[PDB]
Amino acid sequence: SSQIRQNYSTEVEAAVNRLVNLYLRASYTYLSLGFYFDRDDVALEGVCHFFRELAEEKREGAERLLKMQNQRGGRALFQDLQKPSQDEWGTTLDAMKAAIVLEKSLNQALLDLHALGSAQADPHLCDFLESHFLDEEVKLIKKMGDHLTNIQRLVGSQAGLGEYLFEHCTLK
């Protein structure tokens, strides 16, 4: 029986705890992605850094959700964090494809929780997601889509490689 809780449904409280788990799982996935690219037999430092930075972003997302949970008088509950879906992550392309799948899953969970807060007439929750998460996900998915296009361009062809280099070295 919380002294602060107001207009905060048990349904949202539970879904927030699930979303925390999903974000921490995503962080874990990215930690694994990051260290795979740091292997001596893989050795793509920029790819390693890109994923390790995402591990930190997803951890921060979970912590913001947990802070919000307490701000509303809900109770943080933590579950098993499942290990990432793969032990080795293939090429940059394979990894960036797995990343964009992961981000779309998070984005859909965000959208689901928003629809829940809408249905529960919880405008604080709706604003919280909109202001801290929904655009962050859109921007990130756009960037990953950009990357997948450039990765494919570069691995694909003479014409692709040349277009990339002209953009990178002349239009710089």
Q: Which is nearer to Au ion, 123 or 156 (CB)?
A: 123
Between 103 and 122, whose beta carbon lies closer to Au ion? 122
Q: Is 63 annotated as a binding residue?
A: yes
Give CA–CA dist 10/120, Å, rounded.
Answer: 10
Is 53 annotated in some ligand binding site?
A: yes
Burial of 123 (0-12, 13-18, 19+ CB in 10 A): exposed
Interactions with Au ion, residue window 102-121 (CB under 5 A): 118
SS3 for 79?
coil
Q: Give the integer Cα–Cα distance in Å for 94 and 108.
A: 21
Among the candidate windows 4-12, 26-34, 124-132, 143-151, which touches Au ion by CB under 5 A? 124-132
Is 137 known as a binding-site position?
A: no
Residue ranges at the known binding site for Fe cation: 53, 56-57, 60, 63
Residue ranges at the known binding site: 53, 56-57, 60, 63
